[PDB]
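Standup notes, structure subgroup. Blocker cleared on the magnesium ion input:
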Amino acid sequence: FPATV
Amino acid sequence: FPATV
Amino acid sequence: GAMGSMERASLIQKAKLAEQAERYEDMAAFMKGAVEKGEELSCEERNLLSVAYKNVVGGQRAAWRVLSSIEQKSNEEGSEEKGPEVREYREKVETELQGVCDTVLGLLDSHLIKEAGDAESRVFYLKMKGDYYRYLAEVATGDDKKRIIDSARSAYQEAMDISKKEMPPTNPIRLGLALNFSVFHYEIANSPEEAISLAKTTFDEAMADLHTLSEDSYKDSTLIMQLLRDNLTLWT
Amino acid sequence: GAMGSMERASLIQKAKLAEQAERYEDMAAFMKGAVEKGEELSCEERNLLSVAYKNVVGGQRAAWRVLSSIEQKSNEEGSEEKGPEVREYREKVETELQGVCDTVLGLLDSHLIKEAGDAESRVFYLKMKGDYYRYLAEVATGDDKKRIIDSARSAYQEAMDISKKEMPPTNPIRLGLALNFSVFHYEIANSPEEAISLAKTTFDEAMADLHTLSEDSYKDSTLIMQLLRDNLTLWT
Ligand SMILES: COc1ccc(C[C@H](C)CN)c2cc(C(=N)N)sc12
Ligand SMILES: COc1ccc(C[C@H](C)CN)c2cc(C(=N)N)sc12
Ligand SMILES: [Mg+2]
Ligand SMILES: [Mg+2]
Ligand SMILES: [Mg+2]
Ligand SMILES: [Mg+2]
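Run returned:
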């Protein structure tokens, strides 16, 4: 999965 | 801590 | 509210203890109690709220993805029928996830967003609104799916519009918003080109503003810039 | 019982799904429901029960130790008074941990142990009884502390007596029992010499019986033997 914050 | 199972 | 009898300061203190103990459900319950005291949240308090719920919903999302994968395989051609149980349990986790998202969105609507006037609070809360509508969108399938997606987009867009007018391009809230809105474009809105364009423009505009920062602010901003780069590498 | 309307087989299936999703609280609730159907548990089912509750209580114990450490530091000389909150929250986690232990012990007493006649089931359940009394002992401070410790010892001892008469020295249940009873001696009963003696004798008697085993049984037994050795290295 792509990075989120 | 020591190992337990 | 089960936290209605506890002092605000004690709820905040216990949220910090729960974090140290990796008790994120407790942390979230304490911070919900603190929000429900009705006072605005300081910067640290806002981040305690978001950390708590992000960890809770993150575990739910990870579990939902495991179960959804198993369910997809249980319905492929040639697979042995195993009954309703996989769907039922995936639905149970999904309903709990939706309940957490509805709780967070409820706190934002009653009444965190309407009292948030400074950019650092208002952008933070609108990013959260977009994030939790995005989590709802990840599991949505009914008549309201497009409206859920558009609610995420609308919140992210308002946050973006404020952030571009009121915050420097290296502001970590602005960077994290852009990171997450870019992921929304890629994974929810079927807009990979928009996702890549947003991540690249955000990265490049932040790079050009790093020279204005102290050492500690530089570390904060470059951490998120690396996540933008990580996503661009994954997508190109 | 909230699981009373679900089929036994469906509870077992959902426990396995919960494990894959790392949803151990759900796993434990499903397995409690399965036990409460009143039928004896197969070997795999017994291990699903133990895995679920071990993961739940393990998280509670880790959190309790973090909070207890913070509480100890809050009461040292020169420390700033921070109010009742650390103690209250440690007590909250402790009460939840005790509730999980009481639930497990309740399942064992109603009615898993009394129906367990084969060594592999009866030793397993008595080991569990000792383990969950040991977790109660880790947090116990009142008039009943010595009785809690003795309840752990008594259960472990009955399990040991059966295991030595009915199981080979390499049996993984027997090995894990001895590992855990050794830890009870070291960390609960203030008996480090007994802990070391038990771990060493168990290891050496298992070593001498490995020649009788298949490849797969050898792997099962040597895994636990390595834990005995790990503890002996820590203690000597
Ligand atoms: C932007 O996020 C934060 C900024 C500052 C703090 C620290 C506070 C001001 C005193 N040190 C803080 C603490 C967090 C946590 N407990 N996870 S997030 C966070
Ligand atoms: C001694 O522990 C086990 C023995 C055998 C199995 C497998 C079963 C027989 C079919 N493969 C089993 C599964 C476990 C789990 N889900 N954690 S524990 C465990
Ligand atoms: Mg007050
Ligand atoms: Mg634009
Ligand atoms: Mg039936
Ligand atoms: Mg002896």
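Discussed briefly. DSSP finds no helices and no strands in chain B.
Next: hand off to the docking folks.
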